């Protein structure tokens, strides 16, 4: 089984996250315009999916990690990822 | 297995969408700034991807729901989902 | 065991590009407002997922394809598509 990744951009550096869904774990890389590196996020899944928006100069991206028929968001605001209220009954 | 799931946001509220597959079905759930509930998009298919775009404040979504070998484009432009010329040969 | 796609839009007419994998091989179809064609991206891979951003009125997209633990980033910026410097750690 290959892994899985979904991917976001904003700006016009810009700045990239790409999620990766390994065996079950999703981990993050960044590119800002220096390079590749490991970011923050680390979260169960088997599959992931993502989108962000900008306000101002604040990204904000919200990420999905579904196992079996369970979603859950993931929330990045500026500091540190949280658990969002997204439910889905499956 | 798992769900397959696809994401689009647009705005700065902002308004989110999310699909996702599950046993050969693919539905909704929306995000308009207050509470999650169920959108209107109900399409069969196995996989998904989604796409959108605003033209000043008029959102149009594209959905792109496969089955097999086959995908099927489905649209959104203010007033029903409908069945989009996208083809592909596979 | 069906196809696995990802899409991108950029610009109001849109331009839309959906890439989707199909038994290893990635593949693009493109719309520019006048008719679907087929793109110039085709690389391995059993898992795509892309972002796109523009700079003035020129698109750069960056697709990922992944094989296994290898996911390779490949670049659009006007002229070809290139490798990108992407790397991980699966
Ligand atoms: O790259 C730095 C960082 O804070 O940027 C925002 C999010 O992508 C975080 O996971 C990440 O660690
Ligand atoms: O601030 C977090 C939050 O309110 O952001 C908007 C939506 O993603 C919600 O599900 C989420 O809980
Ligand atoms: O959130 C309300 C709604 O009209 O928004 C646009 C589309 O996502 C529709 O499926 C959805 O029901
Ligand atoms: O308005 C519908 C439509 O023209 O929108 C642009 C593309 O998604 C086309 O495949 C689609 O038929
Ligand atoms: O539509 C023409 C084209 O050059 O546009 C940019 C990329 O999507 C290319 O693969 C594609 O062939
Ligand atoms: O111009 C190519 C490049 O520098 O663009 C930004 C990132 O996608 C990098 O991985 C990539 O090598």
Aim: with cysteine; hydrophobic share 30%.
């Amino acid at each position: 089984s290959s892994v899985q990744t979904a991917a976001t951009s904003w700006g016009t550096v810009p700045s990239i996250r790409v999620y990766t869904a390994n065996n079950g774990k999703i981990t993050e890389r960044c590119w800002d315009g220096k390079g590749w590196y490991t970011g923050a996020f680390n979260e169960p899944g088997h599959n992931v999916s993502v989108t962000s928006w900008l306000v101002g100069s604040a990204i904000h991206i919200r990420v999905y990690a579904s196992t079996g028929t369970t979603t859950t968001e993931w929330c990045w605001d500026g500091n540190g990822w949280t658990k969002g209220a997204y439910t889905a009954t499956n």
